[PDB]
Design a protein around this ligand. Structure first.
Ligand SMILES: Nc1nc2c(ncn2[C@@H]2O[C@H](COP(=O)(O)OP(=O)(O)O)[C@@H](O)[C@H]2O)c(=O)[nH]1
Ligand SMILES: [Mg+2]
Length: 361
């Protein structure tokens, strides 16, 4: 039994469209759905073709990492856009990030196909098979495409991209369905007041099934709240299973006290210090005590200081690139997370900024 005249169905896909500068990312996203929410990232919604699809353009990247990380942590499928001769620094950083995130499902879009030739495209695909070997992108399909209605072959590859997205989405739907039996958790990516109905948050159910009228909590505030209503692509629904992108009206909390990264659940860890079992990127500088890094977990990001570095329980003076260690970190703001949330560490001053991934010990 469900609300409405027809169930929503288990058909949806949250897709992140990312990549280096001038890679055709925005043009692709904009041609895949209609522009909706826009901040440092932009949602393009398309629920007119079967699945409730949301494409997130991380348009503030490469300028900021949070744009990229937020887009990836609210999506289940990544589309990495690489233009002709596009093997540059940020394309490399994107590959590293996806791999440090253990991002399972994705596709590489070899954009701007009308500006190149099949033989060059075959050569770029060959190079990529190599660059992605031994990474989570190793078996991702590479699809040549363009979004130029005036090209000799207008929009070639777009139909193929859509088809592959739907296939991958089918696998994701089954994986998310398995999470329905867990306690509910919703990551909030936006929050604002709406005249006539108050506090509204937009986010995605990460696990379990959130239900209209649930009495739960919001973290890091650790405050009781009630879910007044849940909307999916503008229609009220009685429940929202894992993977569902939602809009929710909340009772007992003001939009002004909610930030991207807050979590709705019955329980979350809230701390300002962290002890993480980490794996350091081979493509970063050795990490040392007293150094400063940037931490990302869920949809939160903040600077942190390295207080202590240990290996096999013993304290050391550095963690070299490509090593595993335990990092004791300290920050100023309270962040919310559960043990299953993967942490990312970065050094915003480097060229390739991702330094490591880790989990709370
Ligand atoms: N010829 C051609 N140009 C494209 C295509 N897609 C994007 N562009 C152009 O490439 C440049 C950057 O595109 P954009 O979508 O902004 O990429 P982004 O800035 O990384 O999001 C602009 O000139 C776009 O009009 C394409 O399909 N074919
Ligand atoms: Mg962009």
């Amino acid at each position: 039994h469900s609300s409405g005249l027809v169930p929503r169905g288990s058909h949806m896909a949250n897709v992140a469209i990312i990549g280096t500068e001038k890679s055709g990312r925005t043009s692709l996203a904009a041609n895949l759905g209609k522009k909706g929410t826009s901040s440092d990232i932009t949602m393009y919604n398309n629920d007119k073709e079967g699945r409730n699809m949301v494409f997130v353009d991380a348009h503030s990247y490469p300028k900021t990492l949070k744009s990229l990380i937020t887009a990836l942590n609210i999506s289940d499928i990544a589309v990495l856009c690489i233009p002709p001769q596009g093997l540059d620094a940020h394309t490399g950083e994107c590959i590293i990030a996806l791999d440090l995130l253990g991002f399972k499902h994705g596709i590489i879009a070899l954009t701007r196909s009308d500006s190149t030739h099949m033989h060059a495209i075959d050569e770029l695909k060959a190079k990529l098979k190599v660059i992605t070997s031994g990474t989570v992108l190793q078996d991702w399909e590479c699809i040549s495409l363009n979004t130029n209605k005036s090209a000799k072959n207008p929009f070639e590859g777009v139909d193929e991209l859509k088809a592959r997205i739907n296939e991958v989405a089918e696998k994701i739907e089954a994986e998310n369905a398995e999470l329905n039996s867990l306690p509910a958790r919703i990551f909030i990516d936006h929050a604002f007041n709406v005249t006539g109905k108050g506090c509204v948050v937009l986010g995605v159910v990460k696990q379990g099934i959130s239900k209209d009228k649930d009495k739960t909590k919001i973290f890091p505030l650790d405050r009781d709240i009630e879910i007044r209503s849940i909307q999916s692509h503008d229609v009220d629904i009685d429940s929202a299973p894992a993977g569902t992108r939602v809009g929710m009206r909340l009772k007992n909390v003001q939009a002004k006290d909610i930030e991207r990264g807050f979590i709705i659940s019955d329980k979350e860890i809230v701390t300002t210090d962290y002890t993480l079992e980490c794996t350091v990127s081979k493509f970063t500088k050795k990490i040392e005590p007293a150094s400063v890094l940037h931490l990302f977990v869920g949809l939160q990001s903040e600077p942190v200081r390295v207080e202590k570095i240990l290996v096999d329980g013993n304290e050391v003076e550095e963690a070299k690139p490509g090593s595993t260690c335990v990092l004791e970190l300290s920050g100023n703001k309270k962040l919310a997370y559960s043990k299953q949330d993967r942490f990312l560490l970065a050094n915003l001053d480097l060229t390739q900024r991702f330094a490591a991934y880790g989990f709370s010990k």
